[model samples]
Target: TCPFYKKIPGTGFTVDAFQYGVVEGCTAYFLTHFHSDHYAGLSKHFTFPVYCSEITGNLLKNKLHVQEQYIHPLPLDTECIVNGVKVVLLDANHCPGAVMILFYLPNGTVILHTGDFRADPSMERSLLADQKVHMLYLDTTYCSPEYTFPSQQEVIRFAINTAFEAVTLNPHALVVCGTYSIGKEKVFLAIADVLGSKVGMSQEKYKTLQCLNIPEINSLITTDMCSSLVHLLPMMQINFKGLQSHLKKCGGKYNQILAFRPTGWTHSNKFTRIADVIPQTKGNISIYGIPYSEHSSYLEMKRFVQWLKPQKIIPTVNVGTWKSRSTMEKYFREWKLEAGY
Candidate 1:
């Protein structure tokens, strides 16, 4: 049984996977990536044979902690038929485990669903060499021209440099950062690289790293024996009051402190207000706003569409509901004609 499959009200034709019927039938459910929005519904509701790339399977098993029996880890670019649907998996370079799926029906119809993806030249080169896609389901989260993201390496370098600079500016300051215990392991690794030594981690973080198959990174840090490090910490623990309390209790009378947070304070009303309440020290506790999005940028999306040369492009995720849909539609109209779509 599948979860998502249904007919469009005005379009007359049924879409790929919207489960409005009682006895929903599916040949196969293709999971494009391991992001929470993409895979969250699958983990809870669907029980069909899930098709994804090997990396995606590993991510589901390791990061999302999904069971192995449900996943069918197919090789990239390999074609497979299930319930008369021809399916192909191509690279989607948003994260370690991401993909774009091609579904070819017996009737000359081909549907290309790209999960969250970045169109960096390196990522594009890999994907372009792998498969020919049609009827693209694009990721248009950052479709606006203003939405630009720095490279991953650059963001990492900035954070590392900033953290180290803060520490050097005040040698006795204790630095703390808030990030996902799973996905943001790179930040911890960056911190270790800057320090040239392992730092201490909470028990929950230790377990989270273990699940991600990154024990080596965890090994760099000394873990707290009492606190759980494998699971996400409570919101209270992430707030400034909680951090200040922790610092007061455990900070050994340090004059300065540095902290990093995964949350964008602007997005949350409470965070925005409370962030202002957090007392600032003479040695600043700066929150870096380097965007580390797991989705393609506007330029990247445009470039990816240009390379794919698909006839029709339908956007998935955020673009459909947002005003960016018009922008993407215009881009496709121009780009597809240019590519002879």
Candidate 2:
């Protein structure tokens, strides 16, 4: 029955709630990152003060054309007071500008919001180790035990090696990979650097990467489609039909396509190892489904929960139905109990 669970209780603050529009008693708005789902309801016409990291702030102005005056770029690890409540931003380890929000209410309630994060060991050192948290807003994208997969570094190495071998053997095959608006920059950049190949993308995407302020981006990306055989495209455009049309448009410059469809959905408990995962080939095109996810795996989430041991766990993803919410809470409860908390 509660539809607005995303909003913090007893406070006029909302995190990534722009789409909800004019949340009652909202004093300040927070954005975890520049991803479409988090910033879906925000636009150029927004009047509220939105706080985010500097990289995300630039993307808002450069990509979304949002007014500059209303956006506040907060520095990480610094404490600031918002409506008398203390707030701190920590590196989320999910994307370039993503952050994990830590809120300390006046009544001594500590709330940690994991905004689409990849749980890393560094978090335990950066986060409060001595303090007890009251509530944890978790990014439960892979809450179930079935979603466990290899670490990001493992997947990154696999992707880089796969691309290197494929292109070395078949020089006629064009390499393509699926990417969201901002995530998976590391994978593609690593592959390009390792292979010494230029990346191709739309002018708009190239401009967005410029906002990320990576020195290598300017030299690695090429707007001219014919200059580079390695291309990054939207996740929806990596299918067989899309690849066929794209290759056709290339006018036979490349005979076949080697595509990497990277996502968490590609893995399951059925696979014993990453090497066991196979590619789907049709005609001359070979598509590798990689378990390259930006979100935490089920085991990682459990470790994070056990490490923090918050009193209450509120799942931020897959919480639309009560059934889904309960499943996440069950995991939360189990982890907490295992930790003897």
Candidate 3:
């Protein structure tokens, strides 16, 4: 499980374990992304040399104010030597700066540690396709059978079309996007671009986006509340009462409001149709809980495990107890058997 107390079994790497404090003999510290859970112990005070993607390093330097020398931004898909071990960073397809780390150890063991990932068919075309993995540290957040949902593009399309129709009905309708520090930017950014509307966010969030240096995002952000009908708010504020208070706080700049809450937890296999994602409305406010997720679905995980068929697999999430950990292990064994491994 890559427990916080120790380094990887055969390597001197400690990935996303900064919260446990610095490792006594860690050759290097690796960060997967800027997400809170992955970057828990990161701050300006920590002096370890941290390696991650360039965008993640930018976030560390600009958002967390970590010193420059300690922040090493690695190029994706390029093999580099870290303490005699070959390391490569591949796209995780989870968040903007997230990556799946691939390590070719000195003792001839190939390891893959997926910090957090949404498995897809294209992932099979990477350097991983040519190599056999000895061990896998997986993101088993949704490794169960009941978590199936529509693809990311499908959900994004639904959100965009829904917002387009609402804004067409009334030009002054405010579209509030429920997002976190990094994820779900694409959903709201698409809506803003299609509607030709400016987006309103906290100055801190705007500056964080600036760290990513997205050219289109530069022109779409606005500081004045009344100038833009679309706003980006934290996920906790997407509820009915929260929207009601936010609408009141906005001082009637927009007539009606629609908030899109993009998360995977609200979706299930019971949803048979696109219209099943029903919206809850109260007078002038509406909130839609869309099945837009960053983690792989149950079937996606199965496909990935079967494709890799690593000699050994370990769950990096929801492994607090034997029962929970073994629940995922059962699926891993089943998938490996089906793959004839």
Candidate 4:
């Protein structure tokens, strides 16, 4: 009955969401990713075991200050159990260390709780292709027809081309890209590959960047509001004023400053479905937002849900999903109500 968390009908196992210990009282806690919405409210006071992927474990220990032993590491796609409940963690791919938790309840029901993910049917040995999910807690952030965009791979390609194209046109212009503290390392790697320069990030992302194993793993830490061939800025700093302030600080060392953001919203304003390089001017500065986001678009979500065909499809949002199911059914018409309960 909680908005932030959902309890399995009969299992002792519970899933993500934490607030004032309302969720902390669960028998077990599974963190799907390091994002605030999913990982917030964890504390050193927790005496219970916390479960997450290895990368997410490091983040929990280092960033969130959770005790090491209090956390249990679950590798991708491996089956583990506690108290007769079998659990499998699958890569969510929405962000680094993000995982979709599948719980094989003792009652023979299979529950798939996706923290946040981009569903690609073509992926080799995709978890979606493995088992019949009886109950699915879905990520409906982009669950609408308006979100038709290309695959993340193709979007990254276009983003790289657009960055290089920006450099080609504005030789002195700084190519600023906005990414989360850890998500979208591939975007930086691709930019570095084509530019033959080290990508820059904050200290929070340096250790994880090395783990990416990319050949162009070279990245630097930016302090004192410095610059790079690709000035990798944080997602929080991607606003129009932020870019304008940064460009103003450049002191005209570059002819023009180009700021690009990797997100789904960029797909808008092109009058086109696939957003390649859509540019907008904010106070005379050229800011381009590319469709390099990691979430599954509306179309992709529908396709994946159709294949899943779960008996119960739980919409992650609190927007009266039970009430709005009919309207949402227009988007996922094949999802019969009985599939998800």
TM-score against truth, every candidate: 0.74, 0.94, 0.95, 0.85
lDDT of 2 by residue, 1-341 (tens): 11465688767888888877687778889999988988987879999989899999999998888899989999998898877888999999888899998998888888898888999878899856757889988898888988878887888888888888988998888989888778778777888788777899988888888898677577888888788878988889888999998999898789888898877755353566777666788998888888777888888888888888788887888977899888887777778677899
Taken over the whole model, the C-alpha lDDT of each candidate is 0.57, 0.84, 0.85, 0.70
At residue 200, give the lDDT of candidate 1: 58
On lDDT, the stronger of 1 and 2 is 2
Q: CA lDDT of 102 in candidate 4?
A: 83
Please tell me which predicted candidate would have the highest lDDT against the true structure. Answer: 3
**Cα deviation of 261, candidate 4, in Å:** 1.6
Per-prediction RMSD in angstroms? 6.2, 1.8, 1.8, 3.6
**lDDT winner between candidates 1 and 3:** 3
Best by TM-score: 3
TM-score ranking, best first: 3, 2, 4, 1
Q: Weakest 10 consecutive residues, lDDT, candidate 4?
A: 216-225
Per-residue lDDT tens digits for candidate 3, residues 187-292, read: 8888988898888888888888887756766688876767777898889999989998898887767778999888776644465555566788999999888887
Who is ahead in TM-score, 2 or 4?
2
Ranking by lDDT: 3, 2, 4, 1
Off by over 4 Å in 3: 1-6, 267-269
Compose the digit string of candidate 1's lDDT tens values, residues 1-341.
43232222212223234233333343455666655555544443345566677766776666555678877888776777655556667766666556766666666666666666666676556534555655666677666666655566766776677767767777666666665523555665676568665655656555544543344654565675223111123434655565666566553655555665543212333233222323234333433344455667667778877876876666665543446667667777887677775
Q: What TM-score does candidate 1 get on C-alpha atoms?
A: 0.74
lDDT of 4 by residue, 170-212 (tens): 6786777787656776776687668756666566666555543
